[PDB]
């Protein structure tokens, strides 16, 4: 006798699958993400975004700003030594 009609309705393998939850997530997350960004280091732009670019990028952990800032404090109280002299 005639083969039954349950297989001709699908709406329980289309909404009844687990990656649907991931699908609706990653259509929003990925589709709505700019493939590229603006600029990594730019804070303090006044030729001191350049200071950030040379020293406070994630492209270096080089000791130069530390040295520079340290030397600043040496310059601060030392000048004041000759101001207090």
């Amino acid at each position: 006798v005639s083969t039954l009609i349950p297989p001709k309705v699908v709406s329980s393998k289309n909404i009844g699958s687990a990656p649907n939850a991931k699908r609706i997530a990653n259509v929003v997350h990925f589709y709505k993400s700019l493939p590229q960004g603006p600029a990594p280091a730019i804070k303090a732009n006044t030729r001191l975004a350049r200071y950030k670019a040379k020293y406070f990028d994630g492209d270096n952990a080089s000791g130069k700003p530390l040295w520079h800032f340290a030397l600043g404090i040496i310059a601060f109280g030392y000048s004041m030594e000759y101001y207090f002299h």
Binding site: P38, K43, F56, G58, F69, I73, G77, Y78, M80
Partner: protein, 224 residues
């Protein structure tokens, strides 16, 4: 007005730069500099969840964080050879310690009533010496008041003074003739070694502040 005011401003500006000029506009990838301030976050998360863990630890996590960073930065700044007494103005550090101690004592009294004085009953011990163990528990409890400040103060102050006195001696070795300037460098190398030790122990002392005033807060929040 004062010199002291100028270096307090400098501390504020250093701290601003670590959450401004160290990240690349907050990449999730992370920046080399910003990894440092991640690790600090993690070790105070895991330290103060370890100390003052309970049903809360995050409610006192900012307080312990600004106590970390202040001492952490100020024992590098105070160790620049032309930088003025902030922490080495002992009255500010000891005052900060006493303020926190009073702010624990008041917090304990307020939150835990007059059974706050059950904090100064320490254990179920034989009853004829239970009151004695209250007397010399309170004595040690307000020894916690001055100890916390005096640890940091002594370490930082002694380091700077030690270096300066020995510097003055090597000055006078090299102020007399060159045969004394030979083997005038051998003590100088000792001052360099002492400076290495003094930078190390200031970061160690910084951990000790924030663990001790987590330990005291553990006691204060969780009675006995």
């Amino acid at each position: 007005l004062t010199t002291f005011s100028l270096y307090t401003i400098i501390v504020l500006l250093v701290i601003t730069s670590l959450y401004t000029l160290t990240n690349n506009n907050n990449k999730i990838i992370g920046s080399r500099w910003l990894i440092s301030q991640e690790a600090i976050y993690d070790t105070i998360m895991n330290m103060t969840k370890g100390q003052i863990g309970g049903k809360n630890w995050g409610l006192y996590f900012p307080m312990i964080f600004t106590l970390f960073m202040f001492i952490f930065i100020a024992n590098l700044i105070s160790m620049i050879p032309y930088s003025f007494a902030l922490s080495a103005h002992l009255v500010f550090i000891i005052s900060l310690s006493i303020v926190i101690w009073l702010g624990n004592t008041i917090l304990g009294l307020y939150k835990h009533g007059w059974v706050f004085f059950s904090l100064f009953v320490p254990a179920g011990t034989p009853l004829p010496l239970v009151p004695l163990l209250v007397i010399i528990e309170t004595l040690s409890y307000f020894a916690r008041a001055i100890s916390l400040g005096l640890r940091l103060g002594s370490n930082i102050l002694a380091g700077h003074l030690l270096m300066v006195i020995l510097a003055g001696l090597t000055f006078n070795f090299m102020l007399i003739n060159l045969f004394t300037l030979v083997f005038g460098f051998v003590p100088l190398a000792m001052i360099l070694a002492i400076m290495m030790l003094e930078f190390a122990i200031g970061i160690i002392q910084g951990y000790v502040w924030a663990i001790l005033t987590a330990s005291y807060l553990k006691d204060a929040v969780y009675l006995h």
